[PDB]
Amino acid sequence: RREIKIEGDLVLGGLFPINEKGTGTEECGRINEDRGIQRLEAMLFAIDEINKDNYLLPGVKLGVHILDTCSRDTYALEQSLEFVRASLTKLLIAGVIGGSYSSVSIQVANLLRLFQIPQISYASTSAKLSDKSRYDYFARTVPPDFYQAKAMAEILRFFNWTYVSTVASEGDYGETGIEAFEQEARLRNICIATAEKVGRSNIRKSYDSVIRELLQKPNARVVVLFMRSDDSRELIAAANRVNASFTWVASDGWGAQESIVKGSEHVAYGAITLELASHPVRQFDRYFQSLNPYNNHRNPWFRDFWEQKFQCSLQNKRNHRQVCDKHLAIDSSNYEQESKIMFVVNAVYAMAHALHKMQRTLCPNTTKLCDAMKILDGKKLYKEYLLKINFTAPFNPNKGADSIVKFDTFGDGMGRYNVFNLQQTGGKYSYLKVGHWAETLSLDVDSIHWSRNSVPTSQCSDPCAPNEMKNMQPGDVCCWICIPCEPYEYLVDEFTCMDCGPGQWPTADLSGCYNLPEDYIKWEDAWAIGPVTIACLGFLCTCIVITVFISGRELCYILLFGVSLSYCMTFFFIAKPSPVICALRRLGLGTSFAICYSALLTKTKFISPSSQVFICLGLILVQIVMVILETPGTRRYTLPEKRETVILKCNVKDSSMLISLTYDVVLVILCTVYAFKTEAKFIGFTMYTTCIIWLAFLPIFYVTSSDYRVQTTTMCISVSLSGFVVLGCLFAPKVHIVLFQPQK
Amino acid sequence: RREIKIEGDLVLGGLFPINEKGTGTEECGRINEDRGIQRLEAMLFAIDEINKDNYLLPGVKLGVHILDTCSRDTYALEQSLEFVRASLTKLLIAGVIGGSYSSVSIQVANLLRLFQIPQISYASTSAKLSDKSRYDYFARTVPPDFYQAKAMAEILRFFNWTYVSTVASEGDYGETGIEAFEQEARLRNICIATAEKVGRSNIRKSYDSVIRELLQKPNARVVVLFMRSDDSRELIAAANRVNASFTWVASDGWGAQESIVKGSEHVAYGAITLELASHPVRQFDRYFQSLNPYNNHRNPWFRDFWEQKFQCSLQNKRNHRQVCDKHLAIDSSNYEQESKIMFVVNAVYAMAHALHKMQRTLCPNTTKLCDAMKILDGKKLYKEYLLKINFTAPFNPNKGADSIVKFDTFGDGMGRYNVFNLQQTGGKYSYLKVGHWAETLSLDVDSIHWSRNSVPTSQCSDPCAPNEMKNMQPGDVCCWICIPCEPYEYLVDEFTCMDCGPGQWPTADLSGCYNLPEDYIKWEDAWAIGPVTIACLGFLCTCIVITVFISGRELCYILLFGVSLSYCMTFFFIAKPSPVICALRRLGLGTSFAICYSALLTKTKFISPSSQVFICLGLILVQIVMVILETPGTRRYTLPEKRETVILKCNVKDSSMLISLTYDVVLVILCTVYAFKTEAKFIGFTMYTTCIIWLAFLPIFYVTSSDYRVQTTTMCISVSLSGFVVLGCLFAPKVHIVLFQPQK
Ligand SMILES: N[C@@]1(C(=O)O)CO[C@H]2[C@H](C(=O)O)[C@H]21
Ligand SMILES: N[C@@]1(C(=O)O)CO[C@H]2[C@H](C(=O)O)[C@H]21
Ligand SMILES: [Ca+2]
Ligand SMILES: [Ca+2]
Ligand SMILES: [Ca+2]
Ligand SMILES: [Ca+2]
């Protein structure tokens, strides 16, 4: 019963969410101050200007039949029948400036298409409405949501927010808007933590309940809101009750409205919102601010709008009529243009230009309506003129940013968006443009005020440490686990790690492998150094015995050579092992063995036996023909358990050394039964005892087969022990005779 | 232009998908033989019977205004205006038997609610239509999809199909139907592998493309189809081109139709479909089979239906008029009732009963229409009579299975479903009822024919081995990993495993821990057994020395006791270690030490020194006062690397044993300078040599600190060596005198 009707040659219908959707009991609730009245006056402002100028339908006066949708599709369909009552076969509306809600526009488009009434819809961004095979009389001055979904996944990719949660309003704007976003999120490798839907249906969860589900997954600290204006207002309220806090990535449903966050700015602080690219209509705000509840009689809802805006009473709102000041008026202090005001004016002018071009075609003789337009053809108006319209946007400077009002082949606008940030200015909140999106996002990250004073991170799992690997479970991208690889495996990639080569450390960066260092007994071996001094001390004792003198002299020379060789071999064996000098250590054992053979040969005329005694020993075969070992190469000793432990192992296993030296160890048995021959009796007893000590030492080294570093000292101990026996026993008769008896 | 109109006092509207949806060019395609014509004739059959009998509106003749929806909401809205043309303020349809598609029913309900025309809709199962605040003049003889979603998650829970993929038609039946299923899947811990949508919109992927996405995740071998009849027909076709194969869990959209799988039965074999609980109307098939294209003149689509059903030409379909046999007719050979035929008859009768009760109220005097029904009140008809209707279902035996046609408070039916299985009968495919769902599913699993001849498994990850653990990543239930726990940790639960106690094996089931067995040298030690025989052999030699005889006799007794004790201690030490007998091993070392002290005391009048010699040694303090060890308890030797290796370690560390026995080892040094005293000279030399051998043996045991099993044999070797020295040296003079000289 409440409507706007203005007489005119051609009448344009208009659907505006003038009053916000009511509760369950009341179909129509409070008034929509920004998105229901400013837009309504924008249509009225455009129609006044269209009739004012003489270049757009000068001979035709444009009338209006504007209704209210109450933000409900069912209510919108109820009112929309007035546009079609006179159109039955039996005001003859030429066109309809479509609804401001995707559900409302879709509902009314399904009806108007039957009667061939073209519909231009500002602010309706559902991607379903671009299906021209179903809505064949529908065009919009705003882009679809197929582009807004791109502008979100790009923002969620610029900041590596790969683990996000989605909340979407029920209907067509939210269901299809979030359906395209999850498609654009999959391409950019973004994982949806959880997807929820809110609305007034019984299936939908409560706003507190959906808030809990967002909090259940604390890793995803950003949520994307493809929600309507009322749901966005209420969801932020539900986050105030729980006192939660997220980073809000919002759509044009939220947009750049201060009223959504009114009172709950604490949780909505640092929000990222995607408003369509638009500019204020400067001529419009002059028209709007001049309005008063006394002259705007043509607008029925304006009287109620005046009361609600200023919280005063015109006649009986506060049981009286004195609260509303007579001098009070709309000004820049309390008024800010709705973002989609240009898209309403362009929508109205698109209809006028379509008729104006058609009028110049069907009625060229007269500027007024001719007989061809007594009955109007909707299909001709839409397909030929409206769908191919092209003009400079009125009331906008021709700076190129205003661009054109052209529709594309789908009857849609250009996909350009702005990015806003909710910031606090000394206790006052506002939206600041922090980027845009024409085809690639360009964000001014330095000016963004974040919710927690730092760039939010929304990742399913934390990055893995350099010592840690990760793997992809089937169907997941953003979620992994951090398994630390064992200190011997190495990382070819973060996806898999496996062992290096034997005796090969996996470097420090762990992405490569390098051979483990070889270990050998250095000069730090005090015990080995101490035996070396003892071996040198034994040589000094032999030299003292030699210095004392000056039977046969062959025994003295042979005994001296063996003892010195045994002492010298200990120092040589304690040196740094090498593959070239591997045979020297093997030869070192033979040098002591040759000395032992000489003692047996000497103990067993006299001048002749000396030549056959040393020669009989073999002389170690001239050191195996001047000698590099029995095994041509020296092996790096590596255990199955690496543990950063590698030993230098010569080719010889230290097993055949008991054969070459064992030749001189068998003559002691023949001297075991030897007796008398005095004073040669004492010499034989010492030699037998000396051979006994050598046998015990050999089993000790054989027992210590493992622990080469420890077993290495066994050879030094055996070498020192052998020298003591040879020097103590063989040199003992000389010490007790030459030194013991001063006669010599 | 094609419609059915029958004159009557009250006219009922009817929307049926008589012709299947056409391609892009053609709005209306082929005829819907089962779900568009059988239902249409079912409504006509009911109206004939309602006017036939005299107990349901006897004084009122029921007319019909039946239209075709072409299976499109936009086309359905176009036709539905004929029900409302006469209802403007300026046939006066009393009620509408609603559409067969949720999108169609929702679209037409939004229009009829404005003019207060009650709508009864068979076959429309969208859960959105139960929102009586939005569709306040809508009732259905079929349950909502809120119950069908339960019947799926229950089936997907009966068989542990926790990893499933969902395909849903675009619109209201599929979008809301799968929205409720995923809610019922979350409660029953079911993970959705992937959710995909199909349709004729441009956003939707192709049927081949969505088939590929199903194949991308081969773990989920079962998919749930909340899809319409045409999409289910086409999706199965797309699986034939790829020659894929899944297990199909389907909704009433698929239902029990043979036509969906016509030609692609190979991939659709072993399907699980959820058809609403229904019974054939026996009186109806009699009416249907009697129809011929010559008498059913009231049905315009019937002539086209006759041609398409039998692939013949009536007038010019095949460019001639001879293919259609005159004698050909519908019979049981080629005809099977549509499942939702009773729900159509009940829908028609629900309208008749609502008017009949209203007629008995407003016009009780006459059976005909009175002045109160010249203008009909829709709200009174719906709220008071229709919404509270209750009657026995006509043409159905009163067996209780027919039940009542009552609507609940939401204007819906009872949520009872049947479960069908697609099976092959000798090369012929058919659906077999393999269960039902009233409130709990009752499936006959033995009769189910599965797709791959075995029960399908749809799990995200395979079950973990008993040696393997698993963990839950955030937000996942059905997906895990199988990490094999190391052989020393144990499973408190499958979620976490950690180490057992030191020296405690984690049992065999791995869910517990038991102490590792203790290891000790058993009788298998041949070397230890061999030294025992040698030790016994040494005792025999001493006994032979004693038997030879029969200065002073104290030395012979003291020497014999020490040698026998040394040999005996080796056998005692080689026994099984115990904590009670720990001191015996410590005492065993002292027994040899006491013997060594006796030799020093004897070697160092004669009768008097014997008492002070053995007493001077201390006698091991009477075995430490009859002795169970220095450490009160015996420790189980455990090394940080368990490796199923535990050793029995006595409290004594084998370090103080060199002190008690060392008392008898110091007297040898005093005898080192001893000489002469002949024949006591030989005894002293042997004792000094014997002490020397003991010193070398002690370092060998000290070196072998580790390897207790190996180091254990060191004590046996040392014990045997000590006995040889004592017997060889101390007993040597007696052997060479008593045995060597036959005079004694
Ligand atoms: N994006 C909306 C749409 O339906 O297209 C939903 O929220 C409302 C905004 C507006 O009214 O300007 C639209
Ligand atoms: N479940 C359906 C619905 O829209 O409610 C969708 O597929 C069609 C079945 C029918 O026509 O009997 C319905
Ligand atoms: Ca609206
Ligand atoms: Ca909407
Ligand atoms: Ca239909
Ligand atoms: Ca549907």
End-to-end C-alpha distance for chain A, whole angstroms: 151
Element (H, E) at B554: helix B554-573
Contact residues for A108 (Cβ-Cβ < 8 A; gap 6+): A15, A73, A76, A77, A80, A96, A98, A99, A119
How many angstroms separate the CA atoms of B172 and A128, rounded? 14
Q: Whose CA is nearest to atom 7 of ligand 2?
A: B253
The per-residue b/e assignment along B335-363, b for 16 or more CB within 10 angstroms, e otherwise, is eebbbbbbbbbbbbbbbbbbbbbbbeeeb
**Both tokens assigned to B740:** 């060597």
Count of beta carbons in the 10 Å neighbourhood of residue A612:
10
How far is the CA of B522 from the CAs of A727, B141, B232, B650, in angstroms?
46, 86, 76, 17
| Residues 6+ away with beta carbon under 8 Å from A110 | A135, B73, B74, B77, B107
Q: How many angstroms separate the CA atoms of A566 and A721, rounded?
A: 9
Structure tokens at B282: 């026996």
Identify which of A71, A119, A125 to mutate to test ligand 1's pocket (most ligand atoms within 8 A of the CB).
A125
DSSP E strand boundaries for A391-459:
417-425, 428-437
Distance CA(B420)–CA(B257), nearest Å, equals 10
Rounded to whole angstroms, the Cα distance separating A469 from B278 reads 57
Return d(Cα A55, Cα B85) in angstroms, integer: 41
Residues 6+ apart with CB under 8 A from A740: none
What is the β-pairing status of strands B272-276 and B417-425?
Answer: antiparallel
**Residues near A311 by Cβ (< 8 Å), separated by ≥ 6?**
A323
C-alpha A377/C-alpha A359 separation (Å) is 12
CB-CB contact of A40 with A64 (8 Å): no
Tokens 């773990």, located at residue: B219
The size of the A-B interface in CB pairs under 8 A is: 81
CB A90 within 8 A of CB A69: no
Q: What is the DSSP letter of A404?
A: B
Sign of CA dihedral B529, B531, B536, B540: positive
Strands A489-493 and A483-484: unpaired
**What are the residues facing B429 on neighbouring strands?**
B424
Residue positions of A in the annotated binding site? Answer: 39, 102, 123-125, 173, 252, 340
- Gap sites in chain B (C to N > 2.5 Å), preceding residue numbers: 90, 550, 604, 627, 678
Amino acid B678 reads T
Distance CA B433, CA B440 (A): 16
Cα B655 to Cα B586, B651, B661, distances in angstroms: 10, 11, 11
Cβ contact A225:A253 at 8 Å: yes
- Residues in A touching B202 (Cβ below 8 Å): 130-131
Hey, how many other C-beta atoms are within 10 angstroms of the C-beta on A331?
A: 9
Is there a contact between B28 and B308 (Cβ–Cβ < 8 Å)? no
Q: What is the SS3 string spanning A357-381? A: HHHHHHCCCCCCCCHHHCCCCHHHH
- State the Cα–Cα distance between residues B459 and B157, nearest whole angstrom: 12
Contact present, B225 and B271 (Cβ < 8 Å): no
Same CATH fold, A526-635+651-739 and A4-142+339-386?
no
Tell me the C-alpha distance between A406 and B392, whole Å: 62
Regarding the beta carbon of B169 and ligand 2, being less than 6 Å apart is answered no
- Cβ contact (<8 Å) for A74 and B110? yes
Find the Cα–Cα–Cα–Cα dihedral B581, B587, B591, B597, rounded to 10°.
180
* Angle between the N-to-C axes of helices A708-725 and A582-603, in degrees from 0 to 180, rounded to the nearest 10: 20
Burial track B157-185 (b if 16+ CB lie within 10 A, e otherwise): bebebbbbbbbbbbbbbbbbbbbbbbebb
Q: How far, in Å, CA of B350 to CA of B57, rounded?
A: 12
Atom number of ligand 1 nearest to Cα A124: 5
Q: Using CA atoms, how far apart are residues A140 and A343, in angstroms rounded to an integer?
A: 9
Best probe of the B interface among A202, A219, A705, A725, by most B CBs < 10 A, is: A202
The one-letter code for the residue type at B454 is S
Length of chain A: 744
DSSP-assigned states of every residue in A669-707? HHHHS-------HHHHHHHHHHHHHHHHHHHHHHH--S-
At the topology level, CATH places domain A145-276+416-447 in Rossmann fold (3.40.50)
Phi and psi angles of residue B704, each rounded to the nearest 5 degrees, phi first: -80, 55
> Nearest-CA residue of chain B relative to A129?
B201
Parallel, antiparallel, or unpaired: how do β-strands A191-198 and A222-226 relate?
A: unpaired
Tokens of B46: 């009911």
DSSP-assigned letters across all residues of B626-694: H---SSSS-EEEE-SS-TT-EEEE-S--SSTHHHHTHHHHSHHHHHHS-------HHHHHHHHHHHHHH
Q: Point out the ligand 1 atom lying closest to the alpha carbon of residue A173.
A: 4
Contact B714, B700 (CB under 8 A): yes
As given in the structure block, the two tokens for residue B688 are 């000094």
Question: Which ligand has the minimum distance to the alpha carbon of residue B17?
Answer: 5
d(CA A283, CA A276): 20
CA dihedral A235, A241, A242, A244 (to 10 degrees): 60
Contact call for residues B416 and B277 (beta carbons, < 8 A): yes
How distant, in Å, are the alpha carbons of B134, B144, B189, B228, B272 from that of B248? 34, 21, 20, 14, 6
Helices vs. strands in chain B: H and E counts, helices first: 23, 23
What distance in Å separates the CA atoms of residue B593 and residue B586, rounded to the nearest whole number?
A: 11
Cβ proximity of A636 and A503 under 8 Å: yes
Contact A364, A61 (CB under 8 A): no
Residue of chain A with shortest Cα separation from B697? A696
For the sheet with A10-16, list strands across it.
A4-6, A62-68, A10-16, A95-97, A119-120, A138-139
Pocket lining: B254 vs ligand 2, CB cutoff 6 Å: no
CA distance A365 to A371: 12
Give the residue from B107, B137, B142 showing the smallest Cα distance to B123. Answer: B142
Q: Is the dihedral of CA B442, B444, B450, B454 positive or negative?
A: positive
- CA atoms of B650 and B630, how far apart (whole Å): 9
Residue B624's H or E segment, with its range, is helix B620-626
Taking alpha carbons only, the member of A734, A741, A737 closest to residue A559 is A734
b/e code A704-728 from CB counts within 10 Å (16+ = b): beeebeebbbbbbbbbbbbbbbbbb
> CB under 8 Å to A602, separation ≥6 — which residues?
A554, A555, A558, A559, A610, A613
Both structure tokens of B726? 């004592």
Ligand 2 atom 1: residue of nearest CA: B253
CA dihedral A693, A699, A703, A706 (to 10 degrees): 80
- CATH level 2 (architecture), domain A4-142+339-386: 3-Layer(aba) Sandwich (3.40)
> What burial class does residue B414 get, using C-beta atoms within 10 Å of its C-beta: 0-12 exposed, 13-18 middle, 19+ buried?
middle
- The single-letter code of the amino acid at B371 is D
- CA neighbor of A390 nearest in space, from A406, A412, A371, A410: A406
Structure tokens at B550: 């029969």
Domain A526-635+651-739 has what CATH class? mainly alpha
Structural element, H or E, at residue B418: strand B417-425
Comparing CA positions, the residue from B417, B523, B349 lying closest to residue B153 is B417
A390 class by beta-carbon count within 10 Å (0-12 exposed, 13-18 middle, 19+ buried): exposed
Residue with tokens 């190469």: A633
Where b means 16+ CB within 10 Å and e means fewer, A190-205 reads bbbbbbbbbbbbebbe
User: Which chain A residues are within 8 Å of B194, Cβ to Cβ?
Assistant: 475
3-state secondary structure of B466: coil
In this structure, the strands spanning B489-493 and B496-499 are antiparallel
Rg (CA), chain A: 52
Between the alpha carbon of residue B427 and those of residues B265, B434, B446, the distances in Å are: 10, 20, 21
CA distance B301 to B69: 13
Which residues in chain A are contacts of B128 at CB distance < 8 A? 201
> Residue A488, SS3?
coil
Q: Do A474 and B77 touch (CB under 8 A)?
A: no
CATH 1.10.20 describes domain B526-739: no
> What does the buried/exposed string (b/e) look like for B437-473 if buried means 16 or more CB atoms within 10 Å of the residue's CB?
beeebebeeeebebbeeeebbbbbbeebeeebbbeeb
Where are the domains positioned within chain B? 4-142+280-291+330-386, 145-276+416-447, 468-515, 526-739
For residue A636, what are the CA distances in angstroms to A578, A639, A714?
Answer: 11, 10, 20
Biggest CA-to-CA distance, chain B: 163
Provide the sign of the torsion angle of the four alpha carbons B700, B701, B705, B710, taken in this order.
Answer: positive
Q: Determine which of A111, A170, A198, A477 to mutate to test the interface with B (most B C-beta atoms within 10 Å).
A: A111
In this structure, the number of other CB atoms found within 10 A of the CB of residue A628 comes to 18
Give burial (CB, 10 Å; 0-12/13-18/19+) of A453.
exposed
Q: How far apart are CA B252 and CA B145, in angstroms?
A: 9
Q: How far apart are CA A498 and CA A503, in angstroms?
A: 14
B177: helix, strand or coil: helix
> What is the maximal distance between C-alpha atoms in chain A?
163
Q: Is B173 in the pocket of ligand 2 (CB under 6 A)?
A: yes
CA-wise closest residue to B375 among B116, B159, B29: B116
Structure tokens at A62: 């444009």
Contacts of B415 (CB under 8 A, 6+ apart): B143, B144, B146, B147, B148, B150, B151, B437, B438, B439
Radius of gyration of chain B (CA): 52
CA of B457 relative to ligand 1 center, distance in Å: 45
| Strands A138-139 and A119-120, bridge-based pairing | parallel
- At the top level of CATH, the class of B468-515 is mainly beta
The tokens of B624 are what? 């430490």
Do the Cβ atoms of A588 and A569 come closer than 8 Å?
yes
> What letter does residue A167 receive in the DSSP assignment?
E
Can you name the residues that pair with A28 across neighbouring β-strands?
A: A21
CA distances from residue B52 to B9, B91, B391 in whole angstroms, order as listed: 15, 22, 18
Structure tokens at A510: 């762990």
Q: d(Cα B226, Cα B176) in Å, to the nearest integer?
A: 9
Residues 6 or more apart in contact with residue A416 via CB below 8 angstroms: A143, A276, A277, A436, A437, A438
The answer, yes or no, to whether any atom of ligand 2 lies below 6 A from the CB of B199, is: no
Helix B145-158 vs helix B173-187: crossing angle, to nearest 10:
40
Give yes or no for B107 touching A (CB within 8 A). Answer: yes
Q: Which residues place a Cβ less than 5 A from the ion ligand 3?
A: A 17, 69, 99-101, 104
* A74/B contact by beta carbon, under 8 A: yes
Which technique was the structure solved with, according to the deposited record?
A: cryo-EM
What span, in angstroms and rounded, lies between the C-alpha atoms of B693 and B684? Answer: 15
Tell how far the Cα of A175 is from the centroid of ligand 4, in angstroms. 9
- Report the residue count for chain B: 744
**Phi and psi, residue A537, nearest 5°:** -65, -40
C-alpha to C-alpha distance for A101 and A76, rounded to whole angstroms: 10
B618 in helix, strand or coil?
coil
Q: Do A202 and B128 touch (CB under 8 A)?
A: no
CA proximity to A182, closest of A146, A144, A214: A146
Question: Which atom of ligand 1 lies closest to the CA of A338?
Answer: 12
Q: Which helix (H) or strand (E) covers residue A585, if one does? A: helix A582-603
Nearest of A451, A443, A491 to residue A467 by alpha carbon? A491
Portion 122-151 of A in contact with B at CB < 8 A: 127-128, 130-131, 133-134, 146
Distance A200 CA to ligand 4 centre (A): 12
> For the residues of A528-564, what is the DSSP string, one character each?
HHHHHHHHHHHHHHHHHHHHH----SHHHHHHHHHHH
Contacts of B131 in chain A (CB under 8 A): 201-202
**Torsion angle (degrees, nearest 10) of CA A122, A125, A131, A135:** -40
A297-303 — which CB contacts under 8 Å span 24+ positions? A298/A4, A298/A6, A298/A44, A299/A4, A299/A40, A299/A41, A299/A44, A300/A2, A300/A3, A300/A4, A301/A2, A301/A18, A301/A19, A301/A31, A301/A37, A301/A40, A301/A68, A302/A37
| DSSP H/E element including B696 | helix B681-703
Cβ-based neighbour number of residue A352 at 10 Å: 26
Nearest beta carbon to residue B77 from set A78, A110, A197: A110
Which ligand neighbours the alpha carbon of A69 most closely? Answer: 3
CA A480/CA A189 separation, integer angstroms: 14
Sheet containing strand B62-68, strands side by side: B4-6, B62-68, B10-16, B95-97, B119-120, B138-139
Cβ of B252 below 6 Å from ligand 2: yes
Instruction: Please tell me the CATH superfamily of domain B4-142+280-291+330-386, with its number.
Output: Response regulator (3.40.50.2300)
Neighbours of A464 (CB within 10 A): 17
**Residue B167 contacts residue B196 (beta carbons within 8 Å):** yes
